[PDB]
Design an enzyme around this catalytic site. Structure first.
Site, mmCIF file in Angstrom:
data_model
loop_
_atom_site.group_PDB
_atom_site.id
_atom_site.type_symbol
_atom_site.label_atom_id
_atom_site.label_comp_id
_atom_site.label_asym_id
_atom_site.label_seq_id
_atom_site.Cartn_x
_atom_site.Cartn_y
_atom_site.Cartn_z
ATOM 1 N N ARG A 162 9.826 -1.232 1.247
ATOM 2 C CA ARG A 162 10.965 -1.477 -0.009
ATOM 3 C C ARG A 162 10.344 -1.353 -1.192
ATOM 4 O O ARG A 162 11.636 -2.424 -1.783
ATOM 5 C CB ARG A 162 11.131 -3.476 0.893
ATOM 6 C CG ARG A 162 12.320 -2.613 2.092
ATOM 7 C CD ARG A 162 12.672 -4.563 2.570
ATOM 8 N NE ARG A 162 11.140 -4.639 3.898
ATOM 9 C CZ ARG A 162 11.379 -5.894 3.424
ATOM 10 N NH1 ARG A 162 12.362 -7.090 3.378
ATOM 11 N NH2 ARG A 162 10.326 -6.471 4.978
ATOM 12 N N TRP A 167 11.868 9.170 2.008
ATOM 13 C CA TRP A 167 10.099 9.857 2.753
ATOM 14 C C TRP A 167 9.637 9.101 3.954
ATOM 15 O O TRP A 167 9.999 8.262 3.988
ATOM 16 C CB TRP A 167 10.246 10.125 1.415
ATOM 17 C CG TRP A 167 9.450 9.208 0.727
ATOM 18 C CD1 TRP A 167 7.943 8.392 1.196
ATOM 19 C CD2 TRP A 167 9.748 8.799 -0.845
ATOM 20 N NE1 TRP A 167 8.221 7.810 0.143
ATOM 21 C CE2 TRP A 167 8.439 7.785 -0.989
ATOM 22 C CE3 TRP A 167 11.171 8.729 -1.536
ATOM 23 C CZ2 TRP A 167 9.268 6.822 -2.147
ATOM 24 C CZ3 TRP A 167 11.397 8.261 -2.881
ATOM 25 C CH2 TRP A 167 9.924 6.593 -3.085
ATOM 26 N N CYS A 211 11.064 -3.023 7.340
ATOM 27 C CA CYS A 211 10.633 -1.729 6.128
ATOM 28 C C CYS A 211 10.040 -1.747 5.709
ATOM 29 O O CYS A 211 9.308 -3.127 4.537
ATOM 30 C CB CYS A 211 12.457 -1.319 5.680
ATOM 31 S SG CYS A 211 11.602 0.077 4.572
ATOM 32 N N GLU A 216 4.805 8.799 11.651
ATOM 33 C CA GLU A 216 5.438 7.786 11.857
ATOM 34 C C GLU A 216 5.198 9.631 12.595
ATOM 35 O O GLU A 216 5.774 9.825 13.835
ATOM 36 C CB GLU A 216 7.088 7.698 10.666
ATOM 37 C CG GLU A 216 7.108 6.481 9.822
ATOM 38 C CD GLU A 216 8.598 6.612 8.710
ATOM 39 O OE1 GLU A 216 9.778 6.557 10.186
ATOM 40 O OE2 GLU A 216 8.232 7.252 8.305
HETATM 41 C C1 HEM Z 1 11.739 5.450 0.210
HETATM 42 C C2 HEM Z 1 11.040 5.457 1.258
HETATM 43 C C3 HEM Z 1 10.570 4.634 2.886
HETATM 44 C C4 HEM Z 1 9.736 4.673 3.717
HETATM 45 C C5 HEM Z 1 8.262 5.009 2.934
HETATM 46 C C6 HEM Z 1 10.096 4.067 4.581
HETATM 47 C C7 HEM Z 1 9.726 3.459 5.895
HETATM 48 C C8 HEM Z 1 10.271 2.710 6.738
HETATM 49 C C9 HEM Z 1 9.301 3.026 8.279
HETATM 50 C C10 HEM Z 1 7.459 3.479 8.456
HETATM 51 C C11 HEM Z 1 9.910 2.259 9.390
HETATM 52 C C12 HEM Z 1 9.565 2.162 10.677
HETATM 53 C C13 HEM Z 1 10.498 3.031 10.921
HETATM 54 C C14 HEM Z 1 9.577 3.433 13.021
HETATM 55 O O1 HEM Z 1 8.891 2.370 13.219
HETATM 56 O O2 HEM Z 1 10.356 3.639 13.737
HETATM 57 C C15 HEM Z 1 11.218 2.219 8.760
HETATM 58 C C16 HEM Z 1 12.086 1.365 8.827
HETATM 59 C C17 HEM Z 1 12.928 1.060 8.619
HETATM 60 N N1 HEM Z 1 13.434 1.122 6.892
HETATM 61 FE FE1 HEM Z 1 12.698 2.193 5.580
HETATM 62 N N2 HEM Z 1 11.516 2.984 4.503
HETATM 63 C C18 HEM Z 1 11.685 3.608 3.169
HETATM 64 C C19 HEM Z 1 13.348 4.275 2.770
HETATM 65 C C20 HEM Z 1 14.319 3.581 3.380
HETATM 66 C C21 HEM Z 1 15.383 3.691 3.077
HETATM 67 C C22 HEM Z 1 16.168 4.238 1.268
HETATM 68 C C23 HEM Z 1 16.858 2.115 3.682
HETATM 69 C C24 HEM Z 1 18.173 1.876 3.246
HETATM 70 C C25 HEM Z 1 18.327 1.925 2.533
HETATM 71 C C26 HEM Z 1 15.592 1.839 4.829
HETATM 72 C C27 HEM Z 1 15.934 1.105 5.775
HETATM 73 C C28 HEM Z 1 15.168 0.891 7.217
HETATM 74 C C29 HEM Z 1 15.655 0.144 7.807
HETATM 75 C C30 HEM Z 1 16.898 -0.190 8.229
HETATM 76 C C31 HEM Z 1 14.074 0.096 8.708
HETATM 77 C C32 HEM Z 1 14.365 -0.482 10.552
HETATM 78 C C33 HEM Z 1 14.913 0.581 11.711
HETATM 79 C C34 HEM Z 1 15.227 -0.071 12.411
HETATM 80 O O3 HEM Z 1 14.879 -0.816 13.292
HETATM 81 O O4 HEM Z 1 15.063 1.177 14.144
HETATM 82 N N3 HEM Z 1 14.239 2.212 4.649
HETATM 83 N N4 HEM Z 1 11.037 2.324 7.466
HETATM 84 C C1 LIG Z 2 15.310 6.089 5.917
HETATM 85 C C2 LIG Z 2 13.712 5.813 6.565
HETATM 86 C C3 LIG Z 2 12.316 6.428 6.153
HETATM 87 C C4 LIG Z 2 11.270 6.298 6.399
HETATM 88 N N1 LIG Z 2 10.657 6.735 6.050
HETATM 89 N N2 LIG Z 2 11.931 6.359 8.549
HETATM 90 C C5 LIG Z 2 12.343 5.505 8.691
HETATM 91 C C6 LIG Z 2 12.850 5.495 10.414
HETATM 92 C C7 LIG Z 2 12.843 6.730 10.996
HETATM 93 C C8 LIG Z 2 11.966 7.936 10.955
HETATM 94 N N3 LIG Z 2 11.398 7.755 12.378
HETATM 95 C C9 LIG Z 2 11.452 6.824 12.289
HETATM 96 C C10 LIG Z 2 13.192 6.646 12.741
HETATM 97 O O1 LIG Z 2 13.397 5.186 12.946
HETATM 98 C C11 LIG Z 2 14.488 5.335 14.141
HETATM 99 C C12 LIG Z 2 14.696 3.642 14.922
HETATM 100 N N4 LIG Z 2 13.689 3.481 15.163
HETATM 101 C C13 LIG Z 2 14.287 2.261 16.204
HETATM 102 C C14 LIG Z 2 14.397 3.192 17.660
HETATM 103 F F1 LIG Z 2 14.286 4.862 17.685
HETATM 104 F F2 LIG Z 2 12.808 2.587 18.121
HETATM 105 C C15 LIG Z 2 14.723 3.360 18.878
HETATM 106 C C16 LIG Z 2 14.426 3.276 20.627
HETATM 107 C C17 LIG Z 2 15.791 2.681 21.418
HETATM 108 C C18 LIG Z 2 16.487 1.553 20.977
HETATM 109 C C19 LIG Z 2 15.572 0.497 20.393
HETATM 110 N N5 LIG Z 2 15.527 1.771 18.336
HETATM 111 C C20 LIG Z 2 13.720 5.622 7.817
#
Ligand code: HEM
Ligand SMILES: Cc1cc(N)nc(C[C@H]2CNC[C@H]2OCCNCC(F)(F)[C@H]2CCCCN2)c1
Ligand code: HEM
Ligand SMILES: Cc1cc(N)nc(C[C@H]2CNC[C@H]2OCCNCC(F)(F)[C@H]2CCCCN2)c1
Ligand SMILES: C[C@H](O)[C@H](O)[C@H]1CNc2nc(N)[nH]c(=O)c2N1
Ligand SMILES: C[C@H](O)[C@H](O)[C@H]1CNc2nc(N)[nH]c(=O)c2N1
Ligand SMILES: [Zn+2]
Lengths: 407, 411
Positions: free
Chosen positions: A109, A278, A106, A283
């Site tokens: 953070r 947000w 993330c 994305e």
């Molecule tokens: C406040 C604004 C936030 C922004 C701008 C942000 C940004 C992002 C972005 C750009 C990703 C990559 C997602 C992707 O490429 O699919 C991500 C992944 C992730 N974020 Fe955030 N995030 C935010 C809030 C949060 C919050 C509130 C949480 C949890 C309480 C969180 C937990 C995670 C987790 C666990 C991932 C990995 C998801 C995965 O592995 O598929 N984020 N974040």
């Molecule tokens: C909380 C929060 C804020 C933010 N700005 N952005 C996010 C990630 C969300 C939104 N935009 C992409 C999505 O992330 C969803 C998690 N992605 C995992 C995956 F989709 F790639 C799967 C595919 C198949 C199996 C392996 N992983 C979360």
């Protein structure tokens, strides 16, 4: 044992000690790096509880106090008798914030400590879950001034009474396979959409149909609910210079809200814990719009820009990509829906890393996910070495419920 | 054991067995991934096993494993090691080894080309003047008036570590950088330290923005010596844009030949500390990194000014916009002057085909995702969506310390 990370743009060297507290395993070995792979009892539970309470009581400057010892005693007694235990509200909030803090993938953070935690542990039915979720959605959306939130449903017991949100995100668009052979809407959601239809949903068969929620309470069969449309804030996409852009009929939703992960706090497993923040612009504009296997719109846009699509070296893809992303940010800003661009988010993440290094001794970070999908090296994160390791509390992946659930 | 990699765009799954032949360590453990870390005198005892492993690979590649020629060569090398403490590669083995170090280079996106590599054997070289002559010929051969050809020149291997051959330049052709008293830099800020060394050694610096650096060459552990590559041998391309006529007036140019000269080639446990190699550019190396890194020429602001982009907020994506235009200009300029270059779309598409072929024919292809994915437009290239396994095979190209840090000056 003490590890250095260097930023190659600024020469700033940080020292990591936090990794020594890492518990879970990375997938890598001394012989092989798996850095780019997407998915690499009563006995077990007490060490986990102890480790968590230790960090909790340390965090509130009460390590080794009687209140610390007392709680450790109380939880021990509860596990020995009931085989599990219950988190205090204070521990739940702390654990949720920390799971985000520890999310090495993330970029957002810097915000970790500003997270609204909705305790839904008293929830018992799918209608209950739906009520909780609508309240989360409305609260987080806040008429475009988005606020980070998580809603935490009851924890795993014997694993046959799991709470799950079947959707991958609270808000997503349906995908449909056509007689044509092509795909209408979002191709990522084809299978989930079929499951919705199969469980009774009446699909409107459009390009942007907000999916219904499919909610599973207490290990029961999941049920369908339509989120009140008035709670789902959407943004029509237009370009500040190109008047034709709107003719593409593009829109996206304002609330990113991951619903399919598992929150692990002190050995306890929360299988339904939807969370939201947000968007970072890329994305939507890079991944959702431009991935070949998503809305895949680069060809249409390039054509409307009258670019030379003959040779890859005219960089027509790269040109259209930038314009699509300009439009996303512009449309969100113009409708006053919180969004961050990739320059601003990555700049914030570097400042966050530096804070984490000085105040916590490190920051786990997965470079492969942190670096934005466009313009990598003009963002500061590209030039920043990052160490990736797994700390707990954590958000984890878990198998899609339909592969697991017995009807 | 078998390991699977998936492409998340195509659903193609590949199976890797080659990683079982990896010996060297990654930097990673079960507890920490060091995948984004930039940088994560042998005994007879350690030498014969490395020789044996290499010669077994070589003899298998030519379908002569376990033959009499194979066994005699092992006996001959073994005897040489025990008697002289080292050994000499046959020309055939050097060629095979150099090609394989490239094949094994997990950070190189250009590897579809690995089997077409011109190898210049410079193991009879004895002096810095000799090195200069070899390097001039490599540059002329590789440049080939714009129709670039891959090549490597291999100077004598390390003996006691006190007689090393080293090219002190990090690349054969690079621009000088000068730090001004006011703290600004003229030319390439990456080459300031090396430029200072050249000046100290007696180079007369023109002090411009694109001064080709002299070669600084060390033979046989002696103090290095300066030489100017003949300007007629250094192909350069002035940068202009197909639609923006003011682009030429930024006064930019770049050289055509990318030629890395500071790495160590390891073959069968032997160490070739001077082994400059060259190919041709992928456009982003110049348009993204050399031109737009903040610590390099840093031209983004001036370009966006001239395009009149809205520069008051980052969210207008002015930097992204200027970036694409600069990169269009680089490809346009090279193509217009008939100097080989490849765009990042073509290069990555070719890399995926190479990788799949390598999996089928060789059981794997070690690849470092952090490096393979281009520094602009990452996810619209197919490599972004490709899972990769990174491990270290020998023969290999390794990093080595900068020679100014370790050299014993003789005076
Ligand atoms: C406040 C604004 C936030 C922004 C701008 C942000 C940004 C992002 C972005 C750009 C990703 C990559 C997602 C992707 O490429 O699919 C991500 C992944 C992730 N974020 Fe955030 N995030 C935010 C809030 C949060 C919050 C509130 C949480 C949890 C309480 C969180 C937990 C995670 C987790 C666990 C991932 C990995 C998801 C995965 O592995 O598929 N984020 N974040
Ligand atoms: C909380 C929060 C804020 C933010 N700005 N952005 C996010 C990630 C969300 C939104 N935009 C992409 C999505 O992330 C969803 C998690 N992605 C995992 C995956 F989709 F790639 C799967 C595919 C198949 C199996 C392996 N992983 C979360
Ligand atoms: C023929 C055209 C070639 C192309 C388009 C190409 C492309 C590239 C690129 C873009 C990089 C990353 C450079 C960076 O970001 O610093 C690279 C790295 C590398 N390449 Fe190639 N390459 C080519 C030929 C060669 C040859 C001939 C060799 C050696 C025989 C080679 C070996 C390497 C090695 C060892 C690296 C890693 C360098 C480092 O760690 O600093 N490549 N290649
Ligand atoms: C043979 C070949 C062909 C090609 N297209 N491209 C290349 C890489 C060259 C050109 N364009 C960049 C340069 O790569 C040189 C290696 N770069 C790494 C470094 F200089 F940043 C240092 C930082 C410290 C750690 C070690 N490496 C080689
Ligand atoms: C194979 C590779 O790990 C995969 O394409 C990754 C790369 N980086 C990513 N980065 C982010 N932020 N999100 C993603 O889905 C991915 N996908
Ligand atoms: C810290 C990080 O690993 C470093 O900036 C890397 C990232 N990826 C790269 N990729 C290439 N091709 N070349 C580079 O110099 C770098 N730098
Ligand atoms: Zn690793």
């Amino acid at each position: 044992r003490f590890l250095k990370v260097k930023n190659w743009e600024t020469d700033v060297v940080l020292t990591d000690t936090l990794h020594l507290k890492s518990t879970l395993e990375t997938g890598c070995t001394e012989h092989i790096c798996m850095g780019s792979i997407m998915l690499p009892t009563k006995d077990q539970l007490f060490p986990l509880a102890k480790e968590f309470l230790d960090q909790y009581y340390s965090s509130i400057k009460r390590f080794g106090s009687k209140a610390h010892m007392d709680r450790l005693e109380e939880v021990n007694k509860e596990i020995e008798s009931t085989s599990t235990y219950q988190l205090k509200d204070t521990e739940l909030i702390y654990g949720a914030k920390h799971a985000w803090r520890n999310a090495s993938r993330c970029v957002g953070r810097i915000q970790w400590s500003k997270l609204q935690v909705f305790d839904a542990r008293d929830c018992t039915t799918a209608h209950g879950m739906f009520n909780y979720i609508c309240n989360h959605v409305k609260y987080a959306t806040n008429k475009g001034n988005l606020r980070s939130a998580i809603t935490i449903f009851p924890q795993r017991t014997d694993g046959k009474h799991d709470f799950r949100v079947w959707n991958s995100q609270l808000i997503r668009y349906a995908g449909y396979k056509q007689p044509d052979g092509s795909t209408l809407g979002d191709p990522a959601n084809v299978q989930f959409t079929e499951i919705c239809i199969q469980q009774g949903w009446k699909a409107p068969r459009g390009r942007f149909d907000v999916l219904p929620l499919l909610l599973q309470a207490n290990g029961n069969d999941p049920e369908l609910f339509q989120i009140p449309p008035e709670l789902v804030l959407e943004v029509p996409i237009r370009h500040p210079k190109f008047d034709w852009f709107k003719d593409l009929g593009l829109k996206w939703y304002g609330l990113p809200a991951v619903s399919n992960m598992l929150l692990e706090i002190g050995g306890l497993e929360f299988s339904a814990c939807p969370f939201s923040g947000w968007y970072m612009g890329t994305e939507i504009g890079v991944r959702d719009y431009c991935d070949n296997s998503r809305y895949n719109i680069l060809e249409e846009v390039a054509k409307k820009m009258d670019l030379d699509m003959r040779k890859t070296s005219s960089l027509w893809k790269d040109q259209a990509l930038v314009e699509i992303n300009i439009a996303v940010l512009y449309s969100f800003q113009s409708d006053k829906v919180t969004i961050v661009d990739h320059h601003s988010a990555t700049e914030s993440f570097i400042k966050h890393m530096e804070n984490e290094y000085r105040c916590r001794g490190g920051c786990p970070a997965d470079w492969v996910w942190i670096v934005p999908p466009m313009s990598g090296s003009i963002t500061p994160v590209f030039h920043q070495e990052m160490l990736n390791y797994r700390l707990t509390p954590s958000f984890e992946y878990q198998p899609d419920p339909w592969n697991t659930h017995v009807w």
